[PDB]
Amino acid sequence: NLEQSLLVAILRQHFVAWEQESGTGASQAQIAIDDLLPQLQIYLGDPGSESKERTRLLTLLDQLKGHGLVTSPDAHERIVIRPIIAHLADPINLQALLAWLREQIAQQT
């Protein structure tokens, strides 16, 4: 779903940045959970309760791990974006979803 898709887009951007950093390196394309809060905050809003937004973000991350795109949060509040992400946010799929999103934006009228 499209909230999961927004989070997927953020994770894909982080994944490609990490890939640039390390070529392909190891499978450890890691990110700290606290960094997702500033980003996703802009979109889903700001209910003003850090705990509430953290719960929402962790629910989204858990649902994504249900699809296997991110390891569950660990003791260090860090996760490894599973390499599978590259083939779900494949630029072709990205263009398809982007065209559909432009369609919906037009429908927003």
Across the strands, what pairs with 80?
A: 30
CB nearer to another protein: pick between 23 and 38? 38
| Residue position matching structure tokens 């499209």 | 2
The minimum distance between CB 48 and another protein, in angstroms, equals 8
Q: Scanning the structure block, which residue is given the tokens 């809003």?
A: 45
Decide: is 51 part of the binding site for another protein (CB under 8 A).
yes
Question: Which of 3, 34, 46, 50: binder of another protein (CB under 8 A)?
Answer: 50
Residue type present at position 99? A
| Dihedrals phi, psi of 31, to nearest 5 degrees | -150, 145
38 sits near another protein (criterion: CB under 8 A): no
Which residues contact another protein by CB under 8 A? 48, 50-51
